[PDB]
Structures are given as C-alpha cells and as structure tokens.
A paper describes a structure:
There are two PAS1 molecules in each asymmetric unit, resulting in an antiparallel dimer structure. An additional α-helix (α4, residues 150–163) is located immediately outside the canonical PAS fold in molecule A. Remarkably, the corresponding region of α4 is completely disordered in molecule B. The TodS PAS1 domain constructed in this study did not include the corresponding helix region; thus, the antiparallel face-to-face dimerization observed in the TodS PAS1 structure may be an artificial consequence of the symmetry of crystal packing. During refinement of the apo-PAS1 structure, we noted a region of weak electron density in the hydrophobic ligand-binding pocket. The shape of the region is somewhat similar to those of benzene-derived compounds, including toluene and 1,2,4-TMB. Thus, we thought that the region of weak electron density observed in the apo-PAS1 structure may have originated from contaminants in the incubator (or the laboratory environment). It may also be possible that a cellular ligand, such as an aromatic compound, was co-purified with PAS1 protein. In the absence of a signal effector, the PAS1 sensor domain cannot provide a signal to HK1 via the flexible nature of the STR. This conformation cannot induce the functional dimeric conformation of HK1 to enable autophosphorylation.
TodS/TodT, a two-component signal transduction system, is responsible for regulation of tod operon expression in P. putida strains. TodS lacks a transmembrane region, and its N-terminal PAS domain (PAS1) binds a wide range of effectors, including toluene, to trigger increased basal autophosphorylation of TodS, leading to a phospho-signal relay to TodT and ultimately transcriptional stimulation of the tod operon genes by interacting with phosphorylated TodT in the PtodX promoter region (11–14). In the present study, we determined the crystal structures of the TodS PAS1 domain in complex with either toluene (an agonist) or 1,2,4-trimethylbenzene (1,2,4-TMB; an antagonist), as well that of apo-PAS1. The structure of each PAS1 domain is very similar to those described for other PAS domain structures, which consist of a five-stranded antiparallel β-sheet and three α-helices spanning residues 45–149.
Residue numbers in the entry:
A (entry chain B): 42 to 163
B (entry chain A): 39 to 163
Amino acid sequence: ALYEFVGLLDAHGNVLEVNQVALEGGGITLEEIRGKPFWKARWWQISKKTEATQKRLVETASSGEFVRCDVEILGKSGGREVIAVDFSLLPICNEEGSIVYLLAEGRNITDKKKAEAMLALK
Amino acid sequence: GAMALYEFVGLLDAHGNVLEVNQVALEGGGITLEEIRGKPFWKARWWQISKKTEATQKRLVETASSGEFVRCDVEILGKSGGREVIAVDFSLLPICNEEGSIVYLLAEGRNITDKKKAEAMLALK
C-alpha cells in the first residue's frame, strides 16, 4: 500500500531526504543523518546484526536488485520502542539505466492482520 | 560543500500527484507540503509564472507518467519564498517497482541562474 515511512538515499546508501513520520518514529532529525549511511541511523541500531543487515540490503539495492523483507526497527516513540515493518528498497535508475538513487519504504505491520506466505511444497 | 550535489527534489505518485518535497524546494517556492500534497505537481506555485509554464509542466509530468525520462531547462517561482524567478535544470525520472510498473516520479532541479548569466557573458561577441 502507499508507504508509511519513506526515504531517499544516494546510490551509496547515504541519507538524502526522509519523511517527517519516519524521523518522528526514530527520534532523529534530518540534519543529524543527512549525507551519512542509512544503516547508521537509529532505526537500524537494535544491534550490530540489524546494522549489518541494513548495510547488506543497501548493497543489494545499490547493485540493481529490488529488496523486500520484514525487519524490526527502533521506529516508535522517538526511537524507544521496536516495531516490525514491511521494508522495501527500490533502485532508481537514470535514462541510461545507471543507479542514481535508492528509495526506502516501510509500513508498520505491528497491527496488520496476520498473513500467510506462499511456501513451496518442495 | 559535501551536500551541494543535490538541490530541489520531490516525489510524485505515478500520475504526478505530490507526495513529498524537500525543504529547499518548499522554502524557495513559499509553499507548504499541505497545500500541494495529493494534487498535481503542475498546479504548485513553482510552475505558475504563466499559463504557458503550467501547461508545459503538465506535459512534462504526462511524459514521465508514460514511462519516459524528461530533462530540460525551465524557469520557476523558486527563490525568496516564491517571489523571484530562477532558471532550473529540471528532470523527472519515472520509478518502476520490482514488477516493472511505474510507481513514482522523482522530480529534481538545480538552480542554473548564475550559470546562464555566465554563459551569456562568455558568449558576448
């Protein structure tokens, strides 16, 4: 559905723009994180594993690969509280096909109706 | 400095309705996001120098909405809270999702006013 959180990154994952709702959820101001890697921002700082995971998702998108996965973030009450989020990274190319930005999107799934994945039988 | 690499940017939906705009663009136009959110980009005050400028921006957004990349120079009410005209190198990038469907348009612009002034001076014969 239309995102709840959204951010624009350059192709190295550095933060360019972030909507107010995401900044309020993480307890972060844009000026504090702008120009620096997205994985360093507080949303991704539950642990060294969550940080590393997000750096890896940014590397995958920076390569042209679309990312979608459920993740946990410090994303509620000014960075105090963990929420689960459906998270996506869209590589944005220019007319020649070179990746120039990344779009980070998320929606809070903490109250979303419990859903079943499609699992292979084999 | 380090951040000079980017100036105005906005995120539109696939039909050009406004979703997000950065503060440099809003302050330069004297516009708040709430006056323009969910309504066509070409109705926002940057593009209202005349009916011509508005009609061209609507064409540019329809071009990008069809999946084509747009870049060209334009003039906007984009300095001193919308009070002054600046020339801008303006681009719209259609953004596709994983299935290849257009989901958003990225609007970017850089102020090239001093740049055109300099080109005109170097052009003097």
